[PDB]
Design a protein around this ligand. Structure first.
Ligand SMILES: Nc1c(C(=O)NCc2ccc(C(=O)N[C@@H](CCC3CCCCC3)C(=O)Nc3ccc(F)cc3)cc2)cnn1-c1ccccc1
Length: 328
């Protein structure tokens, strides 16, 4: 049943991996991540050694959460789990978790982009977000560095864990209660803007400067939206004119400007969803209602639980043991 592991020191870091994975080479920003050769598939992979996975309740829950989320994701435009392993033979000796994913070529932060490429890249993000959102999962940290492409411009959403705040929706700039899945659509708008102009749309130096730069584009809220804000601080802070997107994004595909106007809406209740955005004219070349799948249901009940490290650790171990490799 159990493979043969081999040990190796890489960054004064002990890596213990199955013989399956060869020629481990550190990729050191992304965490403890090595490019490896998978002798079973003949394809290169990424192997992530979780850092101090059971150091604390917080780490333990984070470890469990990352493994639960990765085991769930079965979509072309979302990072998926090829393998998860531990060198541990028992729950008793379980202290290290290794995750195996596809190796991606470059982050979108690395990559003048043509309108074709913007269309295809934002299409693939929305297709992935449709899937993630359908399981009631919110990304919450979409930014160029969390999006990866191969040379084929095939895109995957991931979360590696510059500034998040540049891409963050106004309604979660202060308090994290009154928000929905469309926080991720705001992020998609900021990314798409950047892809079209080669500039950060909203390079705020802090959470208040950020809100200033956003309002300068979308305009200060009307009475309609001001009435839906609970926080005296946030309301009293905000308490001018909406710019013509066609002026700001001069020379863009006018259909890219129209979609941007539907994505960068202050009122999160009126912001276009991933599903709706896919059906926008911009994506006429790439939209197929029969190849934009939704996810299986995702059991998120664990998010509400306050459990001990040994409880989170045992749950993670179960999820390692029950893992079913995807087909080749
Ligand atoms: N560097 C790499 C790799 C890698 O590193 N492969 C391992 C790998 C990657 C991502 C995840 C990952 O996305 N994990 C997510 C869960 C899943 C998401 C859920 C929401 C939707 C999108 C997927 C997570 O839980 N992150 C996390 C965030 C904050 C934390 F405090 C703790 C964890 C896990 C393992 C491949 N390719 N590359 C690569 C190489 C060269 C150039 C560019 C990229």
């Amino acid at each position: 049943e159990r493979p043969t592991f081999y040990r190796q020191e890489l960054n004064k870091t002990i890596w213990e991996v199955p013989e399956r994975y060869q020629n481990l080479s550190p990729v050191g920003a992304y965490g403890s991540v090595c490019a490896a050769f998978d002798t079973k598939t003949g394809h290169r992979v990424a192997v992530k050694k979780l850092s101090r996975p059971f150091q604390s309740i917080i780490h333990a829950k984070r470890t469990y959460r990352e493994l639960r989320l990765l085991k769930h994701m079965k979509h072309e435009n979302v990072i998926g789990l090829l393998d998860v392993f531990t060198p541990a033979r028992s729950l008793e000796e379980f202290n290290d978790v290794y995750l195996v994913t596809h190796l991606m070529g470059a982050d979108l932060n690395n990559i003048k982009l043509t309108d074709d490429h913007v269309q295809f890249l934002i299409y693939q993000i929305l297709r992935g977000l449709k899937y993630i959102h359908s399981a009631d999962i919110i990304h919450r940290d979409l930014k160029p560095s969390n999006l990866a492409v191969n040379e084929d411009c095939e895109l995957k959403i991931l979360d590696f864990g510059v500034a998040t705040r540049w891409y963050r929706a106004p309604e979660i700039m202060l308090n994290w209660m009154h928000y929905n899945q469309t926080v991720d659509i705001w992020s998609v708008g900021c990314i798409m803007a950047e892809l079209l102009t080669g500039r950060t749309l909203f390079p705020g130096t802090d959470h208040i400067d950020q809100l200033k730069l956003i309002l300068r584009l979308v305009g200060t809220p009307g009475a309609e939206l001001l009435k839906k804000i609970s926080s005296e601080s946030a309301r009293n802070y905000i308490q001018m004119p909406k710019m013509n997107f066609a002026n700001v994004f001069i020379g863009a595909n006018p259909l890219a400007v129209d979609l941007l106007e539907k994505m960068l809406v202050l009122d999160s209740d009126k912001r276009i969803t991933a599903a709706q955005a896919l059906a926008h004219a911009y994506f006429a070349q790439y939209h197929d209602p029969d190849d934009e799948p939704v996810a299986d249901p995702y059991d998120q009940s664990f998010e509400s639980r306050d459990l001990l490290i040994d409880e989170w650790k045992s749950l993670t171990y179960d999820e390692v043991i029950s893992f079913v490799p995807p087909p080749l």
